[PDB]
Design a protein around this ligand. Structure first.
Ligand SMILES: *c1c(C)c(C)cc2c1nc1c(=O)[nH]c(=O)nc-1n2C[C@H](O)[C@H](O)[C@H](O)COP(=O)(O)OP(=O)(O)OC[C@H]1O[C@@H](n2cnc3c(N)ncnc32)[C@H](O)[C@@H]1O
Ligand SMILES: *[C@@H]1O[C@H](CO)[C@@H](O[C@@H]2O[C@H](CO)[C@@H](O[C@@H]3O[C@H](CO)[C@@H](O)[C@H](O)[C@@H]3O)[C@H](O)[C@H]2NC(C)=O)[C@H](O)[C@H]1NC(C)=O
Ligand SMILES: *[C@@H]1O[C@H](CO)[C@@H](O)[C@H](O)[C@H]1NC(C)=O
Ligand SMILES: [Mg+2]
Length: 498
């Protein structure tokens, strides 16, 4: 029973747990909602955990998993709670939520220039700790400070420094994984196939990552960034985006130029985000040469520390704000979809995308170029396969607040239609995806369904090959090795072999 679970936890010295309560403002509901970053999955109709456990050490994490298995609960692991589909805190079967928020220690070793990072730590907490320790070290990961390292690194982790240094997972050199039996496994213990699989094979599949050991990377004491919003009409916005794609993928590895875009009837807005590993004179000379159409001026270019640049690019007020995991931002529900491209987008693709954005001010797009180091890493170095030959990543987002809930169906329909419009221009056979941008539209396994489970491998190939391409086969072997009994599962987890 739940009381048996409780007894087991006590016997093993795990004290931080809270059982389900109907009391709307119970401590249970407080802990549950503390790390739900998408209000979309926050209402009273959604599944709720039977209990929430907050392990405070690797042994407590090991024993929690050990105890949960003596019952029939589904395990859910949550770090940052940023899952696009709420997969860290929802389940169609009774589940126990293992919340890792107390595992938030970052330990920087300046003598080896590496760090051990407990998996409950956020990217912001990590960046803050790095900046505090050194003005010449940084790390490559995503641009959202509130995202958890647990899910993020497990899925790869792309950001503004990836053209220089690759994904967060491409820079992991050891890890502690707690397996289905509660074993505490470092890189040597888990073996090279499993150490490969965890570095981008997706969270919630292999076991519970207790901590990541990462290599810290050189950054100059001052870098140059810009964040400039152009307010233009569609003719100019189209020509800017069409040229942007070439400038972006082609830039030397020491430069990144990304875009956020949206519109409202005749007014289009494009926010250009620039990063250069170096000083402003070189930064401006490069963009003056390659992209004069942007109309950037001297005062747009800002020199600041690496830590400052990551806080700045995230729209935070100060570096100090990096260190606040529960610092919200906005309170909007959202849905997103993503594409990867292999061929240049024709001008008419950007034109049509902007036309659709112009009709839906709640929608917007995020555009990133690959190339640089992303084209120099082999497709099977880690599970993330989209390397050489991949040109852009394109994200489509629609977001709304409480007062707009009536339009929910309308927003989702808009996003569906945008995705359908882009189909001919983006990757095909299969239409590629990214596991950190998990998308349930592709389908999902009901692990309680016998006929589906028998055919799990074929069925799962739909999303599996989209996220991992030819790396799918090795992932299945790693899964069978580390979690043959499928203790760690969700609608799109890698299936073990029968
Ligand atoms: C910005 C924002 C605001 C969001 C919401 C997502 C972002 C983002 N910016 C990104 C970026 O710049 N670059 C990216 O590559 N991705 C970006 N994303 C997506 C984000 O990376 C993913 O949502 C990421 O998976 C979130 O990680 P998280 O905050 O830890 O999310 P969850 O706790 O919901 O977990 C996700 C998934 O992993 C399993 N999990 C969590 N912790 C685990 C440990 N320690 N071990 C094994 N598995 C773990 C969860 O169970 C769930 O399945
Ligand atoms: C289980 O874990 C939760 C989350 O860490 C624990 O709640 C936390 O408890 C600490 C104190 O032990 C709180 O620290 C202090 O809170 C007070 C009041 O807000 C403040 O004055 C101090 O400066 C400091 O912030 C912390 O707020 C709190 N975190 C949350 C989110 O509630 C809890 O104590 C643990 N439960 C057990 C049984 O140990
Ligand atoms: C199992 O899944 C299939 C396909 O999703 C569905 O048609 C069927 O009804 C399910 N079987 C049971 C008994 O739930
Ligand atoms: Mg009450």
């Amino acid at each position: 029973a739940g009381n048996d679970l409780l007894s087991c936890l006590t016997f093993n010295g795990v004290r931080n747990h809270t059982v389900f309560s109907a009391d709307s403002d119970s401590d249970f509901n407080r802990f549950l909602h503390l790390s739900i970053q998408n209000p979309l999955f926050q209402n009273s109709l959604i599944s709720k955990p039977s209990a929430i456990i907050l392990p405070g050490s690797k042994e407590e994490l090991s024993n929690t998993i050990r105890c949960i298995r003596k019952g029939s609960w589904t395990i859910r692991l949550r770090s940052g709670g940023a899952s696009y589909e709420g997969l860290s805190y929802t389940s169609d079967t009774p589940f126990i939520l293992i919340d890792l928020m107390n595992l938030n220690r970052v330990s920087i070793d300046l003598e080896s220039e590496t760090a051990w990072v407990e998996s409950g730590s956020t990217l912001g907490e990590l960046y803050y700790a790095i900046t505090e320790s050194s003005s010449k070290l940084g790390f490559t990961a995503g641009w959202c400070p509130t995202v958890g390292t647990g899910g993020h690194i497990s899925g790869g982790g792309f950001g503004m420094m990836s053209r220089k240094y690759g994904l967060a997972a491409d820079n992991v050199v050891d890890a502690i994984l707690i397996d289905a039996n509660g074993a505490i496994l470092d890189r040597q213990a888990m073996g090279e196939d499993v150490f490969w699989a965890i570095r981008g094979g997706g969270g919630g599949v292999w076991g519970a990552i207790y901590a990541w050991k990462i290599k810290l990377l050189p950054v100059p004491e001052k870098v140059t960034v810009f964040r400039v919003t152009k307010n233009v009409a569609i003719d100019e916005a189209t020509s800017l985006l069409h040229k942007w794609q070439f400038v972006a993928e082609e830039l030397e590895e020491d430069f990144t130029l990304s875009v956020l875009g949206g519109a409202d009837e005749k007014q289009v807005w494009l926010t250009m985000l620039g990063f250069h590993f170096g000083l402003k004179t070189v930064a401006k000379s490069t963009f003056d040469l390659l992209f004069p159409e942007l109309g950037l001026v001297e005062e747009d270019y800002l020199e600041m520390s690496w830590g400052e640049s990551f806080a700045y690019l995230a729209g935070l007020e100060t570096v100090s704000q990096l260190n606040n995991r529960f610092l919200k931002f906005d309170e909007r529900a959202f849905k997103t979809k993503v594409d990867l491209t292999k061929e240049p987008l024709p001008s008419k693709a950007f034109y049509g995308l902007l036309e659709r954005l112009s009709k839906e001010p709640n929608g917007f797009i995020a555009l990133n170029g690959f190339g640089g180091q992303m084209s120099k890493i082999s497709s099977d170095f880690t599970p993330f396969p989209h390397r050489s030959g991949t040109r852009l990543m394109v994200e489509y987002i629609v977001a709304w607040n409480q007062s707009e809930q009536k339009k929910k169906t309308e927003f989702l329909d808009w996003l569906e239609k945008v995705y359908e419009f882009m189909k001919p221009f983006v990757s095909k056979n299969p239409r590629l995806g990214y596991v950190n941008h998990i998308d349930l539209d592709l389908g999902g396994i009901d692990w309680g369904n016998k006929t589906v489970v028998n055919n799990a491998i074929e069925i799962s190939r739909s999303w599996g090959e989209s996220y991992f391409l030819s790396n799918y086969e090795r992932l299945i072997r790693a899964k069978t090795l580390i979690d043959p009994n499928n203790v760690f599962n969700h609608p799109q987890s890698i299936p073990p072999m029968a």
